[PDB]
Design a protein around this nucleic acid. Structure first.
Ligand code: SAH
Ligand code: ZN
Lengths: 303, 333, 107, 82, 153, 98, 93, 98, 82, 107, 93
DNA sequence: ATCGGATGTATATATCTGACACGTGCCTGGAGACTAGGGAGTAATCCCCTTGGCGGTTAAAACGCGGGGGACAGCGCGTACGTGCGTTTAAGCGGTGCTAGAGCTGTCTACGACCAATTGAGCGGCCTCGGCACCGGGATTCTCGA
DNA sequence: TCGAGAATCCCGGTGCCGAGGCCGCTCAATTGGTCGTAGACAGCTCTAGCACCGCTTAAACGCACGTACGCGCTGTCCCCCGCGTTTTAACCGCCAAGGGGATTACTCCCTAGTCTCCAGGCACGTGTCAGATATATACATCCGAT
């Protein structure tokens, strides 16, 4: 039962927030919104670092490079853009997606970028050349969550068609297709810290922790509110092992890892908590809510 | 099955310790480290002005020794790209090979002189002994763990020396079918175990076990663990290699520009990958952690994957008509 | 003075004494090894058993108690080693084993 | 009693019967006489040697043993006659 | 060539003779990845060989899951059902002018539903056969051929 | 209406029953007269054991069967079912009988 | 005039192999002639071999070599095994 | 311009000179090695007189010439000039070597 | 010193030379190995009997006389070696 | 008592004494007739006469005095009865008599 | 080792038929082996003939009949005439 | 691709028999016992043929490479041959009859076997030289584009 | 279709070793007695062969006829012949160590030969059932209309 208390409320995004991601060094937080802008913030004190502009439509997903220096932003303009966080310049521009890119993520070596779009296609892109290296008709619905595994050899992918599809990267094979004996729209998905497991956020107020080494769901997390928006979840291993997730009831739920019991309820947001980011080293949770709030909030626990 | 156009004047190739980068010798005398996942070049180093004919990777994958056609041998780091060291010797070098368990020691097979083991820390050189002292063309290579050195002459002799002492720990003379002698074209090893192979001038490849070679010791009568050849076309092998595991053996036919892949346990031919007849096959290599094969021919790199039933296959997929065992409660409620 | 023939002493049927006398009266060599007639009769007994086995097999195959020359011909032709032994040999009332080439059969 | 031209006693049905035994379906006519010839040829050897044996036997009739010996000398031995 | 031997050669070479890509006819379609001459086996419709008496109860059962009913009538007694467990032959599109035709051939006493080539099929062509579906009261046919029955039924 | 078998079928059944049967296929007395005619050429007034001439006749018949067999096989190799005298001459040539 | 033969021995070995099966007289004569022929073959072979060795004695070894020259493979194998068994039984008398 | 003879003509002259010549047509040492390889199958460490193996080789060569001759004649009977392995098998079958 | 596969020592030019000597103009390729086979077959007999003679001779080397006797027993005798 | 060779009284060149010795040591009969070696030696002399005559004829036709095996081969294959006598006989260094089939000739 | 042959007699009959012609020792040995072969032939067939007649004395009549067996036609005719002439000459003294 | 009919073939049965299994008395080859000699087996010695290796050469094999040449496929057609059905013919059974010649026994005698005494026809061994094998060069004749 | 070109034939010339002629050195051929015996021959049976003839009939010759395979021709394809170049290892000549091949010299264990006896084998009678034969029957299979 952590005691995450509110230390700083981060606000300034003039539209619906969509993604907040702590920098891998924990020094900055990239708050993205539908306002075509990213906002770099001081991840330890809520100090507004800067705003990176240049996109044409709402940025649905943003993701840091594995070295805290670069940021990939997938915007509703059907394009991705890689900006140097240390300077803000658009180092790369990724064109080719025919629809709304809903998810973008680096590989563990930060040399690859996986991007799932509204066009139901997952595309693999370079970082030093930015060219689209691969493309797959991954799902039958807009792909809203893509993520490399612990080492970049495998990519888990989520779309609105309930499929939790794990693909090979060296050859692009649709290795596994996790289904929970139903078709609930799985909005978000991600691997485990050890890569052996995979957390899938479904749009029925459910977080399913599957054993990817087994291919079957092990843990269930219910009691939160996630039905429409692509709510982002976090693992807490730096301090207490928690499962943190924003919610559509202005609350940020925090369950125990093993027991799957609600161990804390970070209230204070006034809108749907659209995104959550876990500090890579510290016990700082950046919980960002949607347009009726437009605020990110830093929460620090002592247990 | 894949190719690399971004590489020009490709002559030699070599995978890193993990199968992540490919060092390519550029006939203008350059080194192109081409990266796999980005599908692009990872580094470019204009080493010398003379072409590069040999390369090898360090254990950590950071040091690269290279031999040029101008008797030059130089080391370069994968990050700095600078000349770590540069040496010159008579009898132009045919091969250089990092000691697989010591990135300081390096074996050097020259054209005419006996092979020599050098170190990159100190400018020393220990010449390896040769049986007849008149072969003038001897291949030599460390084993998988750099514990020994196998040396094959032009007369079918095989001397297994202790790399540190250069002293005979095993020996035997190989035949050429009837009883004859032959030029040992190459002494190749596998990334797993002691299962190594010998390419000779008789267009026949002989897989052996180095443990059994040490077992026979000095002047034994060892039979090859496996025998491979182009029994149908009688084709000499410009190059041969194992697979990443050691159960598959690739041989490059420059005579017809094809790739014949056999097994090691049984030795039967896995299959054949046919390249264009016009291209002159030059170099072959296997992806040490993938069933993929890189080939170099006429300055062009070609990829040869071995894919699975997937990329669309995963409803459930079956092969043949499955007669469902009708349970006794099938029509029951 | 116990009487016991060399055939009995070898436990065989073919007369060792008769074949020995025959070799003596056959003018093949000045002297003969004593065990040579035994060996020769043994070989003859073995091969005769071999052939008559297949002979009786074909006979009972035709429900025949007494073997007919056709049976011997079929037996020697079916056996590879025997035929090779008797390829340049013909048999009275032997005939030819059934043999039809492929293209002879209509289609 | 002088005998002549009994080679034509070999009837075409007999030749075709021999062919059927040999496993022959369709035959040309020009075979028959040739057959006869070959037959005679075969005969022309063995029977002669036969009487030759009979000649050395100082006998007037031919013995089955004699033709057995002939076929033996001709590498076409026969069984069932001693 | 024996029917079992030709069936085995089909099972061996069908995978390198058929493919599944985007179908201009309907969704995902079987395509001819290499020239398929007439008479040669195109692809077996692999799937669970059930009895026809088992179809209805299974059919209704499949109505509980809404998965595509992949059933082809073997004969008056059995049916190949490939709804959940089958092969790529499920994704062959109906074609009123089919370059392929359906048969049920016997192999050592077991009936396999094999689609053979009605005509010489060529690389890149979408492999399609006639479902032999009766006239209904109407599933529109997108074969694009000339003698389309205006429907699958 | 009268029926007639297709050609060869009757001959095929003949081949079957002949390979099945084992008796002789040549009438005795004509063959014996031929043997006597051939014998009188080398010496007149030569008698014969019945078994002797019988063995002659049967050995000759078997020799002819072997000739017919390998000539028919050669004709198969000649892509024909009808034997031709050149085929028999060829077979004899191969058998060293020429 | 007593005419020697082998019919009794053929009948004996036949009963020893097939007690129920009978035999024809003509077939018996065929068998006898066959035995005579093969025995003459092996005898001539042994004599010619001994002559090639200029040895006026025909012993067992000559018989073994002759039959090994005359019989194809396993025929000769079983034959020489039986002959060795017989000659050993004879020596142990 | 370069000249090339019509096919077979050179081979015809080869046939002429070979029927004219009488030396051997197989290299000695390979044949001898083959003989030793065949011999070691029945017993190892068996020496050979030079004349012995020479006689082996020449007898085998002459046997092969006879086989080539009658196979070529059979191929003529097959109305072809190019020999086919079935022709050789047929010839061996006729020679009683099968 | 163990010998192996020297049957390929019989070169295709040697086979075609033998054919030319036999009077053959055009040849197929599929002949060669078959030839080899047949050759071996021939060898497979005589040489064996050869050592057999040598075996009875209680000797270690093969004599020309031995192979002469072998070919004699095989009905393919040769002259010029005793 | 001067000893003349029996071949002298027989007027032959081949050694009839050696012939009779080889007969007695060949184990063909218990005793060889008196005139049998003379007869067989005469037959052998006549055969040799015919053969070497044809051989020398061929050799002179080939502008040669020394007789090589080729001459013997050609003489053998040039005469019918000699060939039939030695058809089953291989000859060393003989080759083949020049013979080309009809169809092989060009047009 | 005093090895017996016929070479001198071959040369003799050569000079008798071809005075100004040479030979090769190879072809000489060929002729020698031919002599030995036809000789052993005649011997074997004469012995087998006498065996068939149950005789034990191979005499001139047996030789002549053996030649009639082995040689074809006029070859055998001239051979028989020569043998008879030589026998007559030898018996005349 | 099928069914109906015709015809040809495997089956059960009855009985007839004649080869065939069986038993005999009488003969003689085979066994048993014994003696001679000497072919075969063993040993020590010499040779020498072989088996193995070595270096240089190139004729030879391998490889490849057009490309015209024939294997082969199919297709028309027609002659030659299977076939069912006629006819007439000698083949076969058998039974008689005559004896010519195999096939037998008993001489009796010439005839090699064999051994012993004798030695020059013949054979390993040694010069030796001349047809012959090889070479190179020039004239001869086949063959492929006009 | 008359030349060009190429593979060949022959001629002179060179040098060689196998063919041949000649030489000592036997042992194997000759000579002459002597002996036991192979068979040459005489002279007998009898039987198997030879031929006659009649009676029965399956079997052979010829007919007509459909028809289908042999053949003759065509166009295709491929593929093996020809030639050029590149490779290699056969060959050739030599050297060398030895391991078996051949040899001689002993030594004797086995076989031939002799004689004795009897007992298995063989010709010879004798029931007797395996199958050969014949008939009616059910089954298998071609062939043609559909
Ligand atoms: N010829 C055709 N035209 C339009 N739809 C077709 C069709 N044949 C089959 N279908 C549809 O496709 C389904 C069969 S699966 C056939 C392949 C199809 N393209 C697919 O991706 O699924 C059926 O439900 C039917 O409704
Ligand atoms: Zn359609």
């Amino acid at each position: 039962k952590p005691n995450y208390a509110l230390k700083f409320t981060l606000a300034g995004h003039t539209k619906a927030v969509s993604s907040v991601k702590f920098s891998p060094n924990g020094e900055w937080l990239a708050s993205s919104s539908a306002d075509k802008l990213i906002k770099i913030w001081g991840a330890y004190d809520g100090k507004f670092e800067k705003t990176i502009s240049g996109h044409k439509l709402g940025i649905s997903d943003v993701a840091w490079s594995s070295d805290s220096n670069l940021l990939v932003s997938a915007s509703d303009d059907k394009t991705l853009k890689i900006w140097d966080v240390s300077s803000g310049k658009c180092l790369k521009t990724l064109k080719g997606h025919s629809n709304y890119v809903f998810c973008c993520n680096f590989n563990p070596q930060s040399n690859l970028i996986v991007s799932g779009s509204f066009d139901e296609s997952v595309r693999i892109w370079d970082v030093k050349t930015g060219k689209c290296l691969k493309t797959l008709p991954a799902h039958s619905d807009p792909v809203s969550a893509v993520h490399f595994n612990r080492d970049g050899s495998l990519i888990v992918s989520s779309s609105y068609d309930g499929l939790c599809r794990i693909w090979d990267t060296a050859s692009g094979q649709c290795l596994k297709t996790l289904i929970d004996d139903d078709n609930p729209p799985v909005s978000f998905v991600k691997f485990s810290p050890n890569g052996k497991y995979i957390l899938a956020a479904t749009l029925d107020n459910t977080l399913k922790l599957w054993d990817y080494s087994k291919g079957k769901c092990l843990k269930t997390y219910t009691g939160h509110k996630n039905e429409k928006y692509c709510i982002f979840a976090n693992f807490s291993v730096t301090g207490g092992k928690w499962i943190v997730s924003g919610s559509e009831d202005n609350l940020v739920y925090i369950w125990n890892l093993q027991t799957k019991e609600i161990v804390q309820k970070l209230q204070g947001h006034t809108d749907v908590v659209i995104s959550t980011a876990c500090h890579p080293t510290e016990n700082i949770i950046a919980s960002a809510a949607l347009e009726n709030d437009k605020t990110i909030k830093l929460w620090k626990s002592d247990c | 099955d894949g190719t690399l156009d971004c590489i020009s004047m490709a002559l030699t190739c070599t995978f890193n310790r993990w199968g992540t980068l490919l060092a390519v010798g550029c006939n203008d005398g350059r080194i192109v480290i081409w990266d796999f996942l980005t599908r692009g070049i990872a580094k470019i180093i204009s080493a010398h002005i003379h072409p590069v004919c040999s390369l090898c990777w360090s254990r950590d994958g950071h040091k690269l020794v290279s031999a040029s056609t101008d008797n030059i041998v130089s080391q370069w780091d994968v990050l700095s790209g600078d000349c770590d060291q540069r040496f010159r010797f008579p009898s132009p070098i045919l091969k250089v090979q990092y000691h697989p368990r010591d990135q300081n020691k390096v074996l050097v097979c020259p054209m005419k002189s006996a092979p020599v083991m050098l170190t990159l820390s100190d400018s020393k050189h220990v010449v390896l002994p040769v049986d007849d002292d008149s072969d003038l063309n001897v291949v030599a290579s460390f084993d998988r763990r750099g514990e020994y050195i196998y040396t094959g002459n032009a007369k079918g002799k095989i001397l297994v020396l202790k790399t540190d002492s250069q002293d005979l720990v095993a020996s035997f003379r190989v035949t050429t079918g009837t009883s004859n002698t032959t030029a040992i074209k190459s002494i190749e090893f596998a990334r797993k175990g002691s299962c190594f192979l010998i390419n000779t001038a008789d267009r026949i490849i002989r897989v052996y076990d180095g443990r059994e070679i040490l077992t026979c010791g000095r002047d034994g009568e060892p039979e090859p663990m496996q025998k491979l050849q182009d029994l149908v076309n009688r084709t000499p092998w410009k190059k041969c290699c194992f697979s990443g595991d050691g159960e598959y053996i690739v041989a490059g036919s420059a005579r017809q520009h094809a790739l014949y892949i056999w097994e090691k346990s049984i030795g039967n031919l896995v299959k054949i990958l046919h390249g264009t007849r016009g291209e002159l096959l030059l170099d072959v290599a296997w992806h040490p952690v993938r069933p993929i094969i890189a080939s170099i021919s006429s300055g062009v790199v070609s990829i040869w994957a071995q894919n699975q039933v997937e990329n669309w296959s995963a409803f459930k997929e079956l092969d043949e008509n499955v007669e469902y065992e009708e349970r006794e409660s099938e029509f029951d409620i | 003075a116990k009487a016991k023939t060399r055939s009995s002493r070898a436990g065989l049927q073919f007369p060792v004494g008769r074949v020995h006398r025959l070799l003596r009266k056959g003018n093949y060599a000045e002297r003969v090894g004593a065990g040579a007639p035994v060996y020769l009769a043994a070989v003859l007994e073995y091969l005769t058993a071999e052939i008559l086995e297949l002979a009786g097999n074909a006979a009972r195959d035709n429900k025949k108690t007494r073997i007919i020359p056709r049976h011997l011909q079929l037996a020697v032709r079916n056996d590879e080693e025997l035929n090779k032994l008797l390829g340049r040999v013909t048999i009275a009332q032997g005939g030819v084993l059934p043999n039809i080439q492929s293209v002879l059969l209509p289609k | 009693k002088v005998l002549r031209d009994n080679i034509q006693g070999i009837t075409k049905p007999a030749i075709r019967r021999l062919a059927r035994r040999g496993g022959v379906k369709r035959i040309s006519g020009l075979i028959y006489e040739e057959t006869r010839g070959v037959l005679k040829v075969f005969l022309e050897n063995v029977i002669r040697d036969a009487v030759t044996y009979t000649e050395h036997a100082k006998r007037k009739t031919v013995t089955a043993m004699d033709v057995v010996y002939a076929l033996k000398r001709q590498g076409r031995t026969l069984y069932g006659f001693g | 060539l024996p029917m079992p031997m030709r069936f085995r050669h089909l099972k061996k070479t069908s995978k390198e003779a058929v493919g599944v890509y985007r179908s201009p006819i309907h969704g995902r379609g079987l395509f001819c990845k290499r020239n398929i001459d007439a008479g040669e086996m195109v692809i077996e419709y692999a799937g669970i060989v059930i009895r026809s008496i088992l179809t209805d109860k299974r059919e209704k059962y499949y109505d509980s899951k809404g998965i595509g009913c992949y059933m082809f009538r073997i004969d008056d007694s059995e049916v190949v059902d490939a709804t959940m467990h089958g092969n790529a032959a499920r994704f062959i599109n109906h074609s009123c002018e089919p370059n392929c035709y359906s048969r049920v051939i016997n192999i050592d006493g077991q009936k396999h539903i094999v689609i053979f080539a009605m005509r010489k099929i060529y690389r890149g062509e979408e492999l399609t056969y006639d479902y032999k579906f009766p006239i209904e009261d109407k599933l529109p046919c997108n074969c694009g051929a000339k003698k389309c029955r205006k429907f699958l039924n | 209406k009268p029926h007639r078998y297709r050609p060869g079928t009757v001959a095929l059944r003949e081949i079957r029953r002949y390979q099945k049967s084992t008796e002789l296929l040549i009438r005795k007395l004509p063959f014996q007269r031929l043997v006597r005619e051939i014998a009188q050429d080398f010496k007149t007034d030569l008698r014969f054991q019945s078994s002797a001439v019988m063995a002659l006749q049967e050995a000759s018949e078997a020799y002819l069967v072997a000739l017919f067999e390998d000539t028919n096989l050669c004709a198969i190799h000649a892509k024909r079912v009808t034997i031709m005298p050149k085929d028999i001459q060829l077979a004899r040539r191969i058998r060293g009988e020429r | 005039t007593r005419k020697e033969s082998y019919a009794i021995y053929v009948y004996k070995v036949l009963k020893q192999v097939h007690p129920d099966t009978g035999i024809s007289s003509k077939a018996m004569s065929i068998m006898n002639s066959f035995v005579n022929d093969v025995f003459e073959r092996i005898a001539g072979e042994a004599s010619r071999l001994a002559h090639y060795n200029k040895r006026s004695t025909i012993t067992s070894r000559e018989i073994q070599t002759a039959v090994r020259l005359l019989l194809p493979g396993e025929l000769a194998k079983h034959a020489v095994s039986e002959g060795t068994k017989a000659v050993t039984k004879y020596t142990s008398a």
